[PDB]
Amino acid sequence: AGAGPEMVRGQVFDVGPRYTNLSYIGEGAYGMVCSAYDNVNKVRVAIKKISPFEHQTYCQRTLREIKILLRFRHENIIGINDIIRAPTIEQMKDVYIVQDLMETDLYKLLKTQHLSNDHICYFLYQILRGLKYIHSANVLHRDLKPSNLLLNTTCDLKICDFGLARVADPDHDHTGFLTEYVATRWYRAPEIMLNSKGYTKSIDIWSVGCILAEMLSNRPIFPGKHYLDQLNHILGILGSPSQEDLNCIINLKARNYLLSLPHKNKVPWNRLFPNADSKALDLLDKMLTFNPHKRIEVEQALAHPYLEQYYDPSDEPIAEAPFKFDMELDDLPKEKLKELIFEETARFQPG
Ligand SMILES: [N+]
Ligand SMILES: [N+]
Numbered sequence: 001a002g003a004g005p006e007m008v009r010g011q012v013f014d015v016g017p018r019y020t021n022l023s024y025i026g027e028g029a030y031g032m033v034c035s036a037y038d039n040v041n042k043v044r045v046a047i048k049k050i051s052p053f054e055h056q057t058y059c060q061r062t063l064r065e066i067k068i069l070l071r072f073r074h075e076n077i078i079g080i081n082d083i084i085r086a087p088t089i090e091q092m093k094d095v096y097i098v099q100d101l102m103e104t105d106l107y108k109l110l111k112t113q114h115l116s117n118d119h120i121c122y123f124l125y126q127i128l129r130g131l132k133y134i135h136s137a138n139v140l141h142r143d144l145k146p147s148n149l150l151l152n153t154t155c156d157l158k159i160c161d162f163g164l165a166r167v168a169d170p171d172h173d174h175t176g177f178l179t180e181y182v183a184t185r186w187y188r189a190p191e192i193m194l195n196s197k198g199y200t201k202s203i204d205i206w207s208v209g210c211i212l213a214e215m216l217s218n219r220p221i222f223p224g225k226h227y228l229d230q231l232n233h234i235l236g237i238l239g240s241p242s243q244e245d246l247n248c249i250i251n252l253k254a255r256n257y258l259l260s261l262p263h264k265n266k267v268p269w270n271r272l273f274p275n276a277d278s279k280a281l282d283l284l285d286k287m288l289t290f291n292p293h294k295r296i297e298v299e300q301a302l303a304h305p306y307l308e309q310y311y312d313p314s315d316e317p318i319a320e321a322p323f324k325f326d327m328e329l330d331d332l333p334k335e336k337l338k339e340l341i342f343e344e345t346a347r348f349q350p351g
Pocket of ligand 1: 173196197198199200201202203
């Protein structure tokens, strides 16, 4: 089998006899994505071709995503249905990841579709429901954004892409001013630019808040064009932080940067989003709170009046145990990484 060759790792798309049919969907990060007919379950599925074994980073992110997805089981988190690879490490060159077929993502939808308040509400509930599970496993996603939120034709929403995820580590979250960061710029919380490594749950809540804002207007709320511009966008709307919030920033370079800026007043949410439901804007305000300690937590968000039609804690499951396995994976040679990817994928083998 072959699929629309050329460039971007995806000439050969070799998914064994179980999966047939010839439908390019797009480019992932490490290869092409196709839909295919699952001759066993007799439904069409998605297949990602991963060809990560050339780079340490691709491999780390691939191992991370596989370990996490296989351990998680939740309606609002994409699962792995199957993994196709060679029977031996020596022959293992590509890895195919089979998942439920999700026809779009929130990014694509927001390019062309207005969302009713009912859709916004439903999407937000599902995002937070999945996030509650993730956080209950002591895991942080760290790159929540619309393109990492998949949707099917009935509007079921599933969180994807755990390539940047980490185990939460609040005691070791502090860093200096302007510390470089990997996750997508427009969805970074203010503290990332000031004093945070992104090792606490509050980082994800900020991103959800950004996504909420974007659902209300079909435009990213803070589209920074570079590292520090991101902060300037955030302050242009929230206004200058209070003395109390600022006294929380102990590191001098960060504090003094903020102190050097001209005073900016808060732009009221209802002026930015004049057609928004008032309860949505109250919740938005709580998620897009400058001070990460005052920011609302995932369970509190689910409990907010905006989501009252959906909130049901007994039907919002949490993980059976926290993750404590290594998610940094930074001191491992390429050989150990490949071996770990081989071992983590063994359960899908005839073997
Ligand atoms: N954090
Ligand atoms: N503040």
